[PDB]
Design a protein around this nucleic acid. Sequence first.
RNA 1: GGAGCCAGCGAGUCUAACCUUGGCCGAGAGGUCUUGGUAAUCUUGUGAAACUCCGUCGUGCUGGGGAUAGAGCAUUGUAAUUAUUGCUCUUCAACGAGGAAUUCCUAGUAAGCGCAAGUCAUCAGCUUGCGUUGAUUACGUCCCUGCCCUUUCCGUCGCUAGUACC
Lengths: 36, 219, 57
Amino acid sequence: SQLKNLKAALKARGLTGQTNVKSYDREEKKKAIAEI
Amino acid sequence: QVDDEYAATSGIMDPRIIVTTSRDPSTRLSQFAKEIKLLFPNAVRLNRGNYVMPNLVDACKKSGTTDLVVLHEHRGVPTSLTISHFPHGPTAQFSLHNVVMRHDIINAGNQSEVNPHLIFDNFTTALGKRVVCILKHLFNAGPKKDSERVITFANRGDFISVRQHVYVRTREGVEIAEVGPRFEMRLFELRLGTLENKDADVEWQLRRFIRTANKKDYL
Amino acid sequence: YRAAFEDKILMSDIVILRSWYPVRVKKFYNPVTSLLLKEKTEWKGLRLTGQIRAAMN
RNA sequence: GGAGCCAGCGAGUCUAACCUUGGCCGAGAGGUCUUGGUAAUCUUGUGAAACUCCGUCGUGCUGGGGAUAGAGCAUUGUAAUUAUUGCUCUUCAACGAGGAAUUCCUAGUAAGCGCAAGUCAUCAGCUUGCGUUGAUUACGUCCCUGCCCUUUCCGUCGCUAGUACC
Ligand SMILES: [Mg+2]
Ligand SMILES: [Mg+2]
Ligand SMILES: [Mg+2]
Ligand SMILES: [Mg+2]
C-alpha cells in the first residue's frame, strides 16, 4: 500500500538502508527529496 | 491531568467505539463513516436505520462500549461530528469544515491500522486540555515505538486540523506521506452527559453573537 | 435571505446592516484676488448652501 | 374514483394576537363568528402516509410522465397596478429501465412511506428527530488483495574486546 510504495521509492533513491553494510551533491539530494 | 471521567480507566481498558450516522444516510456519509472507523483502531460501524437514541445508548451501554460517534451531513457533505463518552458523558459536538475524503483520491491504496502515534499541538487553555483528553482516549494505549502511523490534531485559531500520515526514517531525514482524510473540526458545544440526555448540564458552549467572537480564541 | 439572531425577533422590529461608504475631497481651489478687482472689497466666490437655496427659493 | 382506516417524537398567546376545536360562508384556496389551551388537561386519538376492499382504465408514450407556457380566483405586505405564497382550467415536452465503469450494504438491516421542530455550529423542499411496512443473500475462508500478531526460527554487513595477516 502507501507504506510499501513509500519504502520502495526511498530505496530506489538510496534514502533507506545502512551506511555500514557491505553486501552526490547535497543540493541534488535535496532535488531528490522534493520529487518524493 | 486526565479528567475524572477517564481517570478511572485511563490507560487500563482499551477503548471500544461505535461509529454511526443519522437516519437515511447518503452514500458519501456512509463512505465518510468508513474511514472514521479506520481512523480509530477499535471502532465498529453500525447501520442506523430506525434506531432510537434511548434504545441505541442503552444497548451500547449494555455491550460495554466506551464511546459513540455519530455523523451528520448536508447533501452528502459531512457537517458535524459528535462524540459521547459512556457511561455518563461528556458529550462533545463538532462541526466539520473543508472535509476531504480518501475516496476523492485515485489509486490511493489501503491504510495501515497499527496503533498510531498521536500529536496534539497548540493546546494550552484548560478547555483545550479537556479536548485533548477527550480525543486522546479514543485510541489504544501504548503504541509500538516503531509504529509507522501518526495522527495529528493541530489547533490553529480554534480550528483543529486533522491529518493522517505514514513516515519512514531515512539516513538524513524523515519523509511523511499523508493518507487522509483532511478535515478541520471545531468544538462548538460540550455537555456533562450522554448525547441522549438533552437536559444534561452544558459545561461549555460556543457564543457566536458576542461582539468579540470574530477575534476570540478558546483552545 | 435567512438570518440567525441571538434572540427571537418580533415582526414589527426592523433589522439593519451597518456599513461604511468612502467619501472624496472636492478638488476646488479659488484664490482670493481682491487687488485685481476695481472695487477691491466685493470679492465673491462659491456661495453658502443657504444662500443658494434662498436665491432659487 | 369511492369506501375502510391506524402511529410516535414534539410545538404552541402578556403586557399578546401563538396552536386552533366547533358553527357559518366559499368549487378550492381561503374568509368569518366563537371557543379550549402558558399546556400528561386545549389544538390532538395530531382519524399521517404508505396500506386494505369495491369499482373505471387497459399494453396504445395510454387515464404513466408533469418539464415549459397562457388565462383567471385568493393571501401577504405596500401604495405600487410592485412583487409574494396558494387554488382553478388549459398546454403536455424528454423519458420505453439506461455504455465504458463505478459506490455502499448483513436484522427490525437494504428498501418503501409519511408526521413533527427549525430550539447560538450546518441546514430551508435542506438538517435532525419520530413513527409505519419490511425483505433476498452470507454469517464460511485465508485461496486473490490488503493489514496486523508471534518466533524473550534462519541468513548479510555491522558495533565492542582480542589474535594475527597485506
Ligand atoms: Mg433507507
Ligand atoms: Mg438526512
Ligand atoms: Mg424521507
Ligand atoms: Mg465475516
